[PDB]
Amino acid sequence: AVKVGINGFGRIGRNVFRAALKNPDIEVVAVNDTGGANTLAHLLKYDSVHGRLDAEVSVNGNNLVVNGKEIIVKAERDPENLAWGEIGVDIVVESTGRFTKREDAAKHLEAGAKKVIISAPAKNEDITIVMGVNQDKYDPKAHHVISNASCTTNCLAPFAKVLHEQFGIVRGMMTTVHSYTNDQRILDASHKDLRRARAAAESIIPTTTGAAKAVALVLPELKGKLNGMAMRVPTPNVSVVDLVAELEKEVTVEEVNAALKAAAEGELKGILAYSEEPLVSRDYNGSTVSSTIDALSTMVIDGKMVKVVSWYDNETGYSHRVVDLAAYIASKGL
Amino acid sequence: AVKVGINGFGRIGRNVFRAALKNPDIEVVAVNDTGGANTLAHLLKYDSVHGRLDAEVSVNGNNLVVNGKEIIVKAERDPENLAWGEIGVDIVVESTGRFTKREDAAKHLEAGAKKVIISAPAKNEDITIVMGVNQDKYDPKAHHVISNASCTTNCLAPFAKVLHEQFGIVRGMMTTVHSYTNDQRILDASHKDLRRARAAAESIIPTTTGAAKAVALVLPELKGKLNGMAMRVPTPNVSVVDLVAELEKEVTVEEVNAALKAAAEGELKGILAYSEEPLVSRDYNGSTVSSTIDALSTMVIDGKMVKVVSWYDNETGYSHRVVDLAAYIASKGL
Amino acid sequence: AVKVGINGFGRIGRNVFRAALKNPDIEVVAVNDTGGANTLAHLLKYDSVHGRLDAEVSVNGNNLVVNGKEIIVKAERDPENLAWGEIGVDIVVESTGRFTKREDAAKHLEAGAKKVIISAPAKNEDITIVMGVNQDKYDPKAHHVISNASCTTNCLAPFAKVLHEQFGIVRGMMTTVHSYTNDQRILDASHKDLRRARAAAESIIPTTTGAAKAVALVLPELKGKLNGMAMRVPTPNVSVVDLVAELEKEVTVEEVNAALKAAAEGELKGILAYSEEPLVSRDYNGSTVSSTIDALSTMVIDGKMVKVVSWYDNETGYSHRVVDLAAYIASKGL
Amino acid sequence: AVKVGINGFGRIGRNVFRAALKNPDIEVVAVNDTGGANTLAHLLKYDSVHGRLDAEVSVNGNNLVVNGKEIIVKAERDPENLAWGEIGVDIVVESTGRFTKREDAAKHLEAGAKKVIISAPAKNEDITIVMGVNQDKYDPKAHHVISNASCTTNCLAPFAKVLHEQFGIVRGMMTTVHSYTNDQRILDASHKDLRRARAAAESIIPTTTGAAKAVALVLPELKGKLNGMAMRVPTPNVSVVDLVAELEKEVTVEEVNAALKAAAEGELKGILAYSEEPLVSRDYNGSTVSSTIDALSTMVIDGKMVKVVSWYDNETGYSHRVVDLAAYIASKGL
Numbered sequence A, B, C, D: 001a002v003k004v005g006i007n008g009f010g011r012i013g014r015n016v017f018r019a020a021l022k023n024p025d026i027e028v029v030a031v032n033d034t035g036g037a038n039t040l041a042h043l044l045k046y047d048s049v050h051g052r053l054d055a056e057v058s059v060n061g062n063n064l065v066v067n068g069k070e071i072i073v074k075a076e077r078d079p080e081n082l083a084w085g086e087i088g089v090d091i092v093v094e095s096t097g098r099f100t101k102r103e104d105a106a107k108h109l110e111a112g113a114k115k116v117i118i119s120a121p122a123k124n125e126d127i128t129i130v131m132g133v134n135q136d137k138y139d140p141k142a143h144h145v146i147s148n149a150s151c152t153t154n155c156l157a158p159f160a161k162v163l164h165e166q167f168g169i170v171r172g173m174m175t176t177v178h179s180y181t182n183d184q185r186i187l188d189a190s191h192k193d194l195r196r197a198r199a200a201a202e203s204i205i206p207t208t209t210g211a212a213k214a215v216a217l218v219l220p221e222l223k224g225k226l227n228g229m230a231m232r233v234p235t236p237n238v239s240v241v242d243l244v245a246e247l248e249k250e251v252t253v254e255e256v257n258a259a260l261k262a263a264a265e266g267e268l269k270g271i272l273a274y275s276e277e278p279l280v281s282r283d284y285n286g287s288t289v290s291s292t293i294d295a296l297s298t299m300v301i302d303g304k305m306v307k308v309v310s311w312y313d314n315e316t317g318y319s320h321r322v323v324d325l326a327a328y329i330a331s332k333g334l
Ligand SMILES: NC(=O)c1ccc[n+]([C@@H]2O[C@H](COP(=O)([O-])OP(=O)(O)OC[C@H]3O[C@@H](n4cnc5c(N)ncnc54)[C@H](O)[C@@H]3O)[C@@H](O)[C@H]2O)c1
Pocket: A007, A008, A009, A010, A011, A012, A013, A032, A033, A034, A035, A075, A076, A077, A078, A094, A095, A096, A097, A098, A100, A119, A120, A121, A150, A151, A181, A182, A314, A315, A318, D189, D190
């Protein structure tokens, strides 16, 4: 139904596409990137991380074709030159990683979009939503530049409000052992971040993250209670959040675990999941959910300090969320 | 000066040997392993992680020759056939990972040895020592079979000691993002631990650790206050401990890093090091210290909860304490 | 239909079990390994390389259950104790890597089986066969202990047969850039081959291969015209064969490739494949054929020296051929 | 002694520096890069492949201070605004990887430099030289923009010269299993080459090379007689060349090895190396020669078709050649 256009057909841009391939409620009609249609078609069809695209992929001049549907390929390095209105695009997915400041994202509105979704933490955005935590706070007539936050945050928010609603978080620290992304370097090179300037596939890399405190944007009640860091390791995909929290109540591992298992099958069904199996990162490559609790890992100390570990496919889970936000936003009418 | 024997010329036994080549107080007169002399000489000469040994290594007859000294090479799969007494070996390093029970390790004393150092946490050992934390409690009369603990406990114990001495640890949880070891599997194959059964270089593999609990064998007060887990990632060496604790008194990062820094410059010098550089895992490959504090990563929340991330080369650092402890043992009188 | 047994539920074993799930002609009734039903069930459904099994895996007693079919699990380290006869097993896939000698594998025939397929190069086998090259030389009366050869010989035979019957080979060299396997070490350790002693995921490891000379066993007139080498690199699966051969006839790239493509579409369909695409190794992960010609790599020098580069999933393509061989054997008579 | 300037302090630039510190004949006085001084003083000191620089690296304003000596750090993206003359730079190493064409690399000459060495193959350069095979063809009067070829041509030519002079190379094909470099992608992303567009640390990536055709530039005797390709694989540094050629004469494995060894000890000492140890790639990380023969791999079929394998540290070997070339040029009187 709703027509979508993607700006930056990259790891998140093509996976959002693959995700949207299914959902007939939305319709990807155009993509924009610095590459040629012939390159974008190849990278869309063969993925080193998720395999082959099961669909018919081809080029019609300078236009993509996938299962009959022809997709428009644009190449404006400047969003203002996009002409969304012309082609009739309603919602635009801003996944270049270059336009997360309102000042660059709003161009899409001026060019004729109705709404804009930023697949990363934005600046001066109208609102930040984590499907499962605050999508209910989306005002159609007031919010147009929308941020879907970061993958880590989408992973941590769901199980944080659940421990908070039932036991109440006093404070907590989080680490994310995360897979390397295209923002790091193959071999040693310059990066605004001297950590990320180091060969990504050779070391464990300490780095910062805004995910933990940015949780207060979706769950205000937790403002100033969390903080955290990250560590990039030698795997191309899949991450795991590690949270240690000081609880307001005395629990047992069996209590902390039943809570999450309840919400995962209840309120949070489809976004939050639960597992009692001893799985490893490769096992989660393809997981469309945001957060998967590893029950075998839950621990409690003195009945008041808890450790909850949760998995998350940083490209797929996150890619299915962008598409879920698109449809939600859409259903509220543009 | 005092003769030493190495049982199990593995990552740990060869590494302790390199360390020991530069220690005037000890002297490795013989090594026992299932492998032959050529193989052992080649693996001693070329190391994929630590590089080529700066020494002249050869195989004369059945014995290794290193810089003139001739090392005795055995192949007795049974500790009591070793005859350490015949050659006059006083301290025997047990690094096969098979003899971790006092009784099994006691077999070296049977054979002529006076002291046995197990390069691993043990079962009913005489005393467990973490250089810098409790080697003072070593009695030359009552203790014969000593455990040097694990590489993780050696990294955590020293800074927990300082945080508890200065601020007081109410309780804490830990996580060691550890490199893979020989105990893991190249590709999916049988294994006691179903997590460790999976390909080591392919995934982020959550697993267990006794390190956190084991701290108490060296730091009594913290009994029941620490706990933690392990995450083995695709790096071949160098690991990192991540401690999140609730302190007694309200601290600030400045206080936390200052107390650590000071302890690193005095009492704990040589064992505990402090770094304010934005470094990564490859950088500590070859460190002799048991724990280098990542000061840039220190953080606190609500003035009572801190996070302290520390580095430790698992092979080299630990190897240097085995040699350290053995020489401390030799000084106490045998 | 045919009842089948597997000895050694490892990399080839579990993969042959997965391939046989498609085959109608055979049926795997019992498996034997050192690992128990519970571990065997886990590793079966969860694979770091091939994914989650898309079937229902359950365990009952010491048996497995996949899609309602109870499979029998044994743990006889000695082959003559399996008793294939009491359970109707006609075919036995020898994949432990231990019983390659005709005299050991023959233990299965002493157990009640009628045919044994050794998943590897053999010593004294009745006949060695590469499907598509010489399956026709199989005599159901004379051959009981068949060698299916190596994954490398299966990749190389099919197009060496074409190049030879087509243009004529005089002499050639081959190198297989190959993924690491379970015969190597995670971290620097003892091994008969001092090259396979080095940390597998860390280096480019040169090693020997008999795959070149083994091709004369099934392509007789190629006796002494070939030889080659191997180089294990840091990828968990999928390999490539690089063949430089001097021909009898003058040729051109265009002709060399036309000859391969034709066979891929006629003669060797299912065994041989042709690729015009600039894909990489991870893209062939799951390829069922034995060899896919990277047609973009074919080269000619002085119109007599050729270079053909073929890809092959060492685990998948091989396994399917094990299933095929089994089904063929059953078709000629049993 | 001879003042040298580096344009582009990347992988080859930083290494060329490190090597330069050993030679007093040259003195690196200036370096140009897009990255800041503080970022360069970090990447220089800490290296994920080659470890820490054994030196005092400091920052002064926006210049480097290394072992007392201050280096002027420039930041001009355009080579014509570099002013190499105002600072006394005689020789300029062009290692940005973007100025491989005369019209661009000439700008340094117009800017004040006397000689230019391009750290890669070039187009329309005054002359292309591989040390030890044709540096005598240098004309200090006619040659100013000098190409130092690639790391591969550097490895392959000196021994190709030996084999050809000695036995006679009718024709031959080559393959270089090569470590990944900074021209690749960490994760599937746009690239001119769709092979290099794929996730670098995850696959075997067949790619192109001109190395084979380039030998002819330095050994015209071998024009149209060689050709080859590249296999980029998941290691961070150190590569290997696999040459398979035809000979006019009939040799034996010993016949060929005696000659490579002889050459290594005679005419080609320092440039070519010979080895009888079963080493692996990490064993060559740090090597300063351009070519080390894996003598355990020489193969001969019929006495006419030979296979020779040679290792090469692509970063270090090449950079010591660059420093060397800068010494020869100077030696002739700029
Ligand atoms: N990779 C992950 O796991 C992940 C997950 C969630 C969010 N994100 C966020 O998604 C955004 C994109 O990240 P990515 O990981 O996909 O990186 P990426 O490099 O794959 O994607 C960038 C895409 O943007 C294109 N591009 C950049 N500027 C362009 C321009 N001006 N015009 C046209 N095309 C342009 C690039 O060609 C590329 O194809 C970032 O904000 C990132 O923080 C990444």
